Amino acid sequence: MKTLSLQSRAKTTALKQPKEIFAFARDIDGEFVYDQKIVKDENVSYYYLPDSKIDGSIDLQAGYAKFKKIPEEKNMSDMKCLLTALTKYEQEHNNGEKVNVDIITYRGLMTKLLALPYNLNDPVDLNVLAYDGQLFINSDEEIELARRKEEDEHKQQSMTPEKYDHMKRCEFSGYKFEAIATLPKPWADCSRQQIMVNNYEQYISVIKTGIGEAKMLLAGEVDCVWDYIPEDGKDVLSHYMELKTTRILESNGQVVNFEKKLFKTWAQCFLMGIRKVVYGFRDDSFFLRDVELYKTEEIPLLIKNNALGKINCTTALKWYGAVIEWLLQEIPRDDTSKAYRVSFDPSTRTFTLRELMGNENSRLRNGEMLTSEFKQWRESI
């Protein structure tokens, strides 16, 4: 049970340029797509939102009843599909050799670590295991499942039916916005009818990146493309976009709320190499009132210069660098007999690394994180 100081900072931010090496997707029917040409031909959305229809006429809550919601049991809580795609990549594009990184994980999990210093009320629990000279990092399914139910219970005990329903519609409005702001294909290739709202569709980019001395593989969802996907697969990340929604800023409190949202959005995009974010601003009746395009690199200065402890993107990044370095130093890379858990506890404000002693290792190495298909492949090399 080792701990890391919450004031830990890396010497420099030590940045590296990320690059996508492969992608996979879950389509609108819950099926997974792994072919590289197919996924970019059929599972990519394209940004299209005329300034004409940003006049307060569009209700982001309209059609809430026809929301196609995936049951949260099946929402990639494991690493199965990621490892399926990674296996394919190593077989077909890495000459049958393992990808050359130290860490393999999801973008969202790293965002949690990166945003931690200014979100000390949010618990973090990550399973870490060493395999084939690499660290695999995932959230814990049973913990996530239990934490998800407890948070819903709290909401039900603290919210009226009206406010609870309002929350659900806020969630829906984000997916609604993505639907009305994107096209299945470029304009020229679309019908005029095109010119279900769901959370099934997920386009997952997988990038090689890093920080400091660490080389990392991050899998992260991408909302859409700003213009086009280049054919030679070069600098593809620079064409991706992120789509977000939030309430219009009509008070100081909401500006504070937005700055905290904008910071998490920056973290999300920065780790992934996403250079563009679009925020849709809605009123209480969910009508789309305004839109704003952000360059990811301009957000840290926006936050710092805001006339409202104080969120610092550079500080957060230095903390992130210290954490990654700590994990690679404290977890033996060649011991495959153990499993570890990194945990941040809000009530004690402690950041701990510990060896799991309940034989969680057995389940993690046989389904939840490592899969039989992936292990056999790595063994065969």
Ligand X SMILES: NC(=O)C1=CN([C@@H]2O[C@H](COP(=O)(O)OP(=O)(O)OC[C@H]3O[C@@H](n4cnc5c(N)ncnc54)[C@H](O)[C@@H]3OP(=O)(O)O)[C@@H](O)[C@H]2O)C=CC1
Residue ranges of the binding site for substrate? 106-108, 221, 244, 268
Query: Which residues, numbered 256-315, are part of the site for ligand X (CB under 6 A)?
Result: 268
CB of 284 to Ca ion, least distance (A): 21
The residue with tokens 């049991």 is 73
Name the minimum Å distance from CB 223 to Ca ion.
5
Instruction: In whole angstroms, give the CA distance from residue 366 to residue 162.
Output: 44
Strands ordered across the beta sheet of 182-183: 182-183, 46-47, 224-225, 240-247, 276-282, 288-295
CB of 268 to ligand X, least distance (A): 5
Distance CA 164, CA 222 (A): 28
Q: Cα separation of 243 and 236, whole Å? A: 17
CB of 137 closer than 8 Å to CB of 126: yes
**Maximum Cα–Cα distance across the chain:** 61
Nearer to Ca ion by C-beta: 213 or 290?
290
350 binds, among ligand X, Ca ion, none (CB under 5 to 8 A by kind): none
Q: Which of residues 230-249 bind Ca ion (CB under 5 A)?
A: 243
Binding flag, residue 76, ligand X (CB under 6 A): yes
Q: Compare residues 203 and 340 and give the one whose CB is closer to Ca ion.
A: 203
Using the contact rule CB under 6 A, the part of the chain among 102-110, 231-239, 251-259, 325-333 near ligand X is 102-110
User: Does position 107 bind ligand X by CB under 6 A?
Assistant: yes
Pick one of 22, 24, 106, 279: the residue that binds ligand X (CB under 6 A): 106
Residue from 338, 297, 295, 316 nearest 114 by CA: 316
How far is 237 from 275, CA to CA, in rounded Å? 8
Q: What are phi and psi of 288, to 5 degrees?
A: -70, 110
Among 30, 108, 233, 367, binds ligand X (CB under 6 A): 108
Helical pair 313-330 and 107-115, crossing angle rounded to 10 deg: 120
- The entry of Ca ion, ligand X, none near residue 212 (CB within 5 to 8 angstroms by kind) is none
* Alpha carbon distances (Å) from 301 to 81, 270, 314, 326: 37, 14, 10, 28
**Residue 112 binds which one of ligand X, Ca ion, none, with CB within 5 to 8 A depending on kind?**
none
DSSP-derived pairing of the beta strands 134-139 and 2-4: unpaired
As annotated, the binding site for a divalent metal cation includes: 178, 223, 242-243
Minimum gap (Å) between residue 177 Cβ and ligand X: 10
- Min CB(380)–ligand X separation in Å: 27
Shortest distance in whole angstroms from residue 76 CB to ligand X = 4
Q: Can you tell me which of 20, 78, 140, 221 binds ligand X, judged by CB under 6 A?
A: 221
The piece of 17-25, 89-97, 216-224, 297-305 that touches Ca ion (CB under 5 A) is 216-224
Size of the site for ligand X (CB under 6 A): 12
Cα distance from N-terminal residue to C-terminal residue, the chain: 35
Integer angstrom CA distances of residue 102 from 94, 127, 128, 192: 16, 15, 12, 48
Between the alpha carbon of residue 368 and those of residues 94, 150, 254, 331, 341, the distances in Å are 25, 22, 39, 20, 14
Query: How many CA within 13 A on the CB side of residue 41?
Result: 6
| Candidate segments 103-111, 206-214, 290-298, 350-358, binder of ligand X by CB under 6 A | 103-111
Please identify which residue in 87, 111, 119, 182 interacts with ligand X, judged by CB under 6 A. Answer: 111
Q: Which is nearer to ligand X, 89 or 203 (CB)?
A: 203
Binding residues: 106-108, 178, 221, 223, 242-244, 268
List residues binding Ca ion (CB under 5 A): 223, 243
List residues binding ligand X (CB under 6 A): 75-76, 106-108, 111, 174, 202, 220-221, 244, 268
